[PDB]
């Protein structure tokens, strides 16, 4: 079915224009529907900007359309927005959405934070069991990444491979830097002897790091 | 704007046991209300639209009702896999608006937390620091508290707790709680404590290691 997808900057300083764009694949935009752009405030409240329809009328949510634009390019199958004069009030995840009376459809989302810092990659160390662990059965292996902003980062294991008791704590913000925890458990007879690793993102930051955690010796 | 409002901000429920969600507008919406499901990390996926239309591929157990100002969703017998915020949401008129949300927990049996803890890692000690953490794994309900403590002495500034969002099988939850310090200040201390009380126990969870031996 159709799949959409949300791209854009992280980060845009105030009183700078953000422009996001939606690429829309399996179905064509000018074939039928209405095409929505909707956000998320971080305390989770969602509001509806507006949409481009299949014959290219827009229509806005009135508290934005003094500054809002939504426009499309049908070569490309994508369509974008494009909000001026943004202040921090417009930190939010962004979401492009098919649909009329009920939105069947949505992006994966992608989040914008207005603010006036720079950009600063992840610093991501180990954190290995003390040795002193002789409870055998199970092993508790994982990741430390902090002094990173903005928000988000992405944390994998094994490339993805390791998805079971995978515990990720949520973020938090110390003066003016993020930091979170991943935390693996194994089973005792697979980390000694196979190799674990955490993948870490930082989009913002184009920053790929990966991390080898080595045995206690 | 129609106003929508989602009465139960929060609520805590057993498995198998049948829940009801109330959403209510401002002023008449017809039958142009849908409901949405958004778990944690996703993005909100439709349920029922229509009032009580239940969407392509939704489980049975969710079902709608509802006209004018008063709607109510309904989840017949609740699965630990329903953990999630839930919207409801109006097409009626423009603009269209949301409500909210209503957040469903899980409630189960007490279980005492697994402790870990981490001493810092070269890489760090590199660059002046040093985070010790200590990790409490799998257990209910949510509440606990954690003390630090230095070669025997409490130690409350320079740490850091959070959690995790409720597992979507076993539901338990984790927190790691992460002391920080510098270099100099970790290498003058040898005992690292991490104590940990929980309605589980009487007597705390205790978890320490030796810098003269990791």
């Known amino acids: 079915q159709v799949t959409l997808s949300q791209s854009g900057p992280g980060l845009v300083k105030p009183s700078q224009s953000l422009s996001l764009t939606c690429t829309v694949t399996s179905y064509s935009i000018t074939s039928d529907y209405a095409w929505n752009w909707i956000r998320q405030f971080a305390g989770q409240s969602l509001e509806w900007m507006g949409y481009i329809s299949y014959s290219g009328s827009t229509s806005y949510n009135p508290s934005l359309k003094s500054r809002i634009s939504i426009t499309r390019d049908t070569s490309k199958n994508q369509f974008f927005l494009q909000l001026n004069s943004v202040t921090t009030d417009d930190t939010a995840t962004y979401y492009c959405?098919?649909?009329?009376?009920?939105?069947?459809?949505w992006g994966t989302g992608t989040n914008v934070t207005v603010s006036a810092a720079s950009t600063t990659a992840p610093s991501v160390f180990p954190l290995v069991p003390g040795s002193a662990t002789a409870a055998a059965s199970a092993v508790t292996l994982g990741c430390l990444v902090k002094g990173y902003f903005p928000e988000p980062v992405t944390v994998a294991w094994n490339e993805g491979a390791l998805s079971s008791g995978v515990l990720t704590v949520s973020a938090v913000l110390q003066s003016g830097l993020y930091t979170l925890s991943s935390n693996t458990t194994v089973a005792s007879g697979t980390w000694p002897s196979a190799s674990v690793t955490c993948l870490v993102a930082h989009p913002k930051s184009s920053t790929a790091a990966d991390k080898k955690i080595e045995p206690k010796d | 704007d129609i106003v929508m409002t989602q009465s139960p901000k929060s609520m805590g429920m057993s498995v198998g046991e049948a829940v009801t969600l109330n959403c209510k507008a401002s002023?008449?919406?017809?039958?142009?209300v849908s409901w949405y499901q958004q778990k944690p990390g996703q993005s909100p996926v439709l349920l029922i639209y229509?009032?009580?239309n239940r969407y392509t591929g939704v489980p049975d157990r969710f079902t709608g009702s509802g006209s004018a100002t008063d709607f109510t969703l309904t989840i017949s017998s609740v699965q630990a896999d329903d953990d999630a915020d839930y919207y409801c949401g109006q097409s009626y008129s423009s603009p269209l608006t949301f409500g909210g949300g209503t957040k469903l927990e899980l409630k189960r049996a007490d279980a005492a937390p697994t402790s870990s803890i981490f001493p810092p890692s070269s890489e760090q000690l590199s660059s002046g620091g040093a985070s010790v953490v200590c990790f409490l794994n799998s257990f209910y309900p949510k509440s606990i508290a954690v003390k630090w403590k230095v070669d025997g002495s409490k130690r409350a500034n320079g740490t850091a707790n959070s959690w995790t969002d409720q597992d979507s099988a076993s539901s338990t939850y984790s927190m790691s709680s992460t002391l920080t310090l510098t270099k100099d200040k970790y290498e003058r201390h040898n005992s690292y404590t991490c104590e940990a009380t929980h309605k589980t126990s009487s007597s705390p969870v205790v978890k320490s290691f030796n810098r003269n031996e990791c």
């Open positions: 229509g009032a009580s």
């Open positions: 002023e008449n919406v017809g039958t142009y």
């Open positions: 959405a098919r649909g009329g009376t009920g939105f069947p459809y």
